[PDB]
Write a protein that binds this ligand. Structure first.
Ligand SMILES: Nc1ncnc2c1ncn2[C@@H]1O[C@H](CSCC[C@H](N)C(=O)O)[C@@H](O)[C@H]1O
Ligand SMILES: Cn1c(=O)[nH]c2nncnc2c1=O
Length: 243
């Protein structure tokens, strides 16, 4: 098992602090999550641990993060040492992992768009269902199936999408985060039908897609038209699933 983000490392945090789109996805994700006081939380594809750590700061009781990258987990562990917080981390490929516990909330910000096959997409959703209490929920952030590179690039928002190539029944996109120097990565755009089948066959009886929450203050702080591609050719979507 290999990890692209072993070569990205601290550049990912640089991206989160410069990219115009990051504030929108953070707001949208916490809108979906809601109150976390007292809840047990599993943060999948956790990176340096941003969401799980913020969730702990907002009141969570137990927070575990999982990422495929040894480098990203080293950074996540370093952040928890700096702040003295109780987050625990594990290096795993979520597509192949065994349950680590039963959680009230699974957060998966930029997990499912790294599944490299529909088989692995379906395995990830099964792993998530097996990690959830019956009254729990999954909150996810992923690639909108309806994105099309022909309808405009996302470089100005922080993600330069290089191409769009067929990959089984979906598409693979090679991309760069807008950092200095740019950080290469690749992701997958699976169809809405394949997502919804993966969700149902994993045992989730309810799901909802959530469009990113752009606000008046975001519009005011950029030139006119800045957000047109973001709004009219969305690369990102939220997703909430319940057992
Ligand atoms: N199959 C897999 N299992 C677990 N983590 C994976 C994965 N494929 C990619 N990742 C991880 O997914 C992360 C995407 S970046 C997102 C990090 C974090 N959720 C945040 O939003 O701040 C990277 O850290 C990458 O190593
Ligand atoms: C498509 N895409 C984004 O737009 N933003 C991202 N931000 N962080 C991590 N991954 C991604 C991603 O794959």
């Amino acid at each position: 098992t290999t990890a692209r983000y072993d070569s990205i490392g601290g550049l990912f945090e640089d991206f989160t602090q410069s990219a115009a789109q990051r504030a929108i996805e953070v707001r949208t994700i916490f809108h979906m999550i809601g109150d976390v006081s007292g809840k047990s939380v599993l943060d999948l594809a956790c990176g340096f641990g941003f969401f799980g750590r913020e969730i702990y700061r907002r009141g969570a009781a137990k927070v575990v993060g999982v990422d495929i990258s040894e480098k990203m987990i080293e950074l996540a562990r370093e952040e928890s040492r700096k702040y003295g917080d109780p987050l625990e981390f594990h290096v795993r490929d979520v597509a192949n992992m065994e349950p680590l516990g039963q959680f009230d909330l699974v957060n998966a910000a930029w997990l499912f768009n790294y599944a490299d096959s529909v088989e692995n997409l379906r395995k990830m959703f099964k792993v998530v269902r097996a990690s959830l209490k019956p009254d729990g929920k999954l909150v996810a952030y992923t690639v909108d199936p309806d994105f099309s590179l022909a309808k405009g690039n996302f470089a100005k928002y922080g993600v330069n999408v290089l191409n769009e190539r067929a990959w089984g029944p979906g598409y693979r996109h090679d991309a760069e985060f807008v950092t200095d120097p740019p950080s290469q990565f690749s992701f997958y755009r699976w169809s809405r039908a394949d997502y919804e089948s993966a969700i149902a066959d994993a045992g989730f009886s309810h799901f909802e897609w959530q469009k990113p929450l752009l606000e008046a203050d975001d519009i005011a702080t950029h030139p006119p038209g800045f957000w047109d591609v973001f709004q009219n050719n969305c690369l990102q979507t939220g997703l909430v699933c319940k057992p």
